[PDB]
Amino acid sequence: GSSGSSGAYSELQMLSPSERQCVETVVNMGYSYECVLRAMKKKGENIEQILDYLFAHSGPSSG
Incomplete structure (x- = not known):
């Protein structure tokens, strides 16, 4: 799911x-x-990360 060169932020709108x-x-x-968004683009694909x-x-707030 990619082709259009121009349009980066567009992804955010219609992420994967x-x-x-x-x-x-x-x-x-x-x-x-x-x-989360940034983190996602930072750590990539890994909730844990x-x-x-x-x-x-x-x-720090567990629960």
Whole structure:
């Protein structure tokens, strides 16, 4: 799912099924979209990772 050269941020608008779930997932866990988004593009594809990175920014609150 890619071809159009021009249009990067466009993805955000219509992310993929793997990215959407990633975001949504965490977003559901009780996180932000922007952060998660970045984290996702930072850590890539790996909730755990995104979580590890997220926590960093996020505050320590288990439960």
